Amino acid sequence: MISLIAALAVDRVIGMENAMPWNLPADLAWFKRNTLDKPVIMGRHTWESIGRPLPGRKNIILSSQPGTDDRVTWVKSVDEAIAACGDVPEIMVIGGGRVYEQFLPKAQKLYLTHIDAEVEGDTHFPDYEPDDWESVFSEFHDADAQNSHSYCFKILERR
Amino acid sequence: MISLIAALAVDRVIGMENAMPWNLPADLAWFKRNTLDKPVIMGRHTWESIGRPLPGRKNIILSSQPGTDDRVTWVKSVDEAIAACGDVPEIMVIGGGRVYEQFLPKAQKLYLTHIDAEVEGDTHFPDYEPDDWESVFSEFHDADAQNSHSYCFKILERR
Numbered sequence A, B: 001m002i003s004l005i006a007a008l009a010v011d012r013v014i015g016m017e018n019a020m021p022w023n024l025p026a027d028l029a030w031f032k033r034n035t036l037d038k039p040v041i042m043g044r045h046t047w048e049s050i051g052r053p054l055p056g057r058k059n060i061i062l063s064s065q066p067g068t069d070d071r072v073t074w075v076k077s078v079d080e081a082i083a084a085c086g087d088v089p090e091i092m093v094i095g096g097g098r099v100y101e102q103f104l105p106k107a108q109k110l111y112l113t114h115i116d117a118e119v120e121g122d123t124h125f126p127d128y129e130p131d132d133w134e135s136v137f138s139e140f141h142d143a144d145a146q147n148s149h150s151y152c153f154k155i156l157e158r159r
């Protein structure tokens, strides 16, 4: 089962290359709880933004360029990223844009962090008709001393 | 001697009601570099924002209210925060606003991070007289894959 996880600003703006203008350790904890122990698919700008392999996860990099690092699996296509994963029950695709675009039609679940931030951007999360998907979980949180902005956690299941 | 270390958005903004909306790991590695093995003074609201005691430095909390944690030294005056530091060549003030205001006139050195972020803030760094300080180091950097905004590092020494 392929799942997408993403953190979206207002209008569905996503990162392109530079780090997003927010501080949300609570989203990073939600990211780790829901990816640990699973294989992760990412694109190359995602890679470098992390800057190291995620521990306790199988790191798969889908790119046309080439394997700088030995600690991660370098794949050139959709299908080879799929296979690199094995027979697991849940595959996490963690971004960026292009990567989302390519896995979504294949995807069964959406983990989304909806953040109350107005950011300028070219890239947006692919359009998904929330009518072809069921909200299974929704929880809002207010900004605080550690979290820069309000946020919403959401789980959607492809109906 | 005493030194102040601060991050400042445009117009000298140093604090919002919630977490600052930037992600600047560069700034934290500059902060640790410059504060390691020195005593740090802070106010309470900065302590609660860090979450724990900073590693490798002596933690001083400047507060009229009494202590919640055994791992740090709590002080109720500027002169007991000094005395508690001992015989160290340089004492680090770390914020927030009112702490910097009390310590300003005693400070000999400023380690400043200028961030190109336009934010409404709560608290501001005190107004200093720029003709009274000499820049002895400047370094600019653009936003990147890990840092949300451009910034510049400066050290100023009192003329």
Ligand SMILES: CN(Cc1cnc2nc(N)nc(N)c2n1)c1ccc(C(=O)N[C@@H](CCC(=O)O)C(=O)O)cc1
Residues within 6 Å of the ligand: A005, A006, A007, A027, A028, A029, A030, A031, A032, A046, A049, A050, A054, A055, A093, A094, A095, A112, A113
């Ligand atoms: C830039 N990047 C991509 C990233 C960031 N937040 C997202 N948030 C969501 N919800 N979804 C994504 N796909 C997402 N991806 C990062 C950067 C750091 C960490 C990381 O350091 N995560 C630690 C948890 C935090 C910490 O160790 O400092 C983890 O083990 O997963 C993860 C992703």
Ligand SMILES: CN(Cc1cnc2nc(N)nc(N)c2n1)c1ccc(C(=O)N[C@@H](CCC(=O)O)C(=O)O)cc1
Residues within 6 Å of the ligand: B005, B006, B007, B027, B028, B029, B030, B031, B032, B046, B049, B050, B054, B055, B093, B094, B095, B112, B113
């Ligand atoms: C809210 N806070 C106050 C803070 C933040 N940025 C600053 N930036 C500067 N230049 N000056 C300050 N006084 C400043 N103060 C923080 C929060 C986290 C850390 C912190 O975790 N720092 C690690 C470095 C980062 C990593 O190891 O997570 C450390 O050893 O100093 C320090 C200060």
Ligand SMILES: [Ca+2]
Residues within 6 Å of the ligand: B134, B135, B136, B137
């Ligand atoms: Ca100079």
Ligand SMILES: [Cl-]
Residues within 6 Å of the ligand: A042, A043, A044, A045, A046, A047, A095, A096, A097, A099
């Ligand atoms: Cl990417």
Ligand SMILES: [Cl-]
Residues within 6 Å of the ligand: B042, B043, B044, B045, B046, B047, B095, B096, B097, B099
């Ligand atoms: Cl404070």
